[PDB]
């Protein structure tokens, strides 16, 4: 899928999440998510969110009821700094490799 805003769901994977969330949650985490979710404009939901124990999820999760999408995303946290979080939801690149299967040999046996 190479689509986000069109479609009511994010292109992202259940792992992907996981780390976006513990990315933003760290020491050396260079930005952070509470001013992340300002730059896209849930700045009044930053509270709402802190409310509750995994905050980071339900931030990702909320990002696209709003309308935004992976773009939009990575837009703010190349702004804050968050350059792993970035490379990290495009996702590595994709080299072809051969099955090393043994191909069949001549007839008569």
């Known amino acids: 899928g190479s689509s986000g805003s069109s479609g009511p769901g ?5 792992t992907a999440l996981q780390n976006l969330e513990q990315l933003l949650d760290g ?11 300002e730059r896209l404009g849930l700045r009044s939901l930053v509270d709402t969110y802190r409310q509750t124990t995994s905050p980071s999820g339900s931030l990702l999760r909320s990002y696209e009821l709003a309308g935004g999408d992976l773009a939009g995303l990575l837009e703010a946290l190349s702004d804050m700094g968050l350059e792993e979080g970035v490379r ?3 996702g590595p690149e994709t080299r072809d490799k051969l099955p090393s299967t043994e191909v069949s040999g001549p007839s008569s046996g």
């Open 88 to 90: 990290l939801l495009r």
């Open 27 to 37: 020491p050396e985490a260079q930005g952070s998510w509470a001013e992340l979710a």
């Open 10 to 14: 994010l292109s992202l994977g259940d």
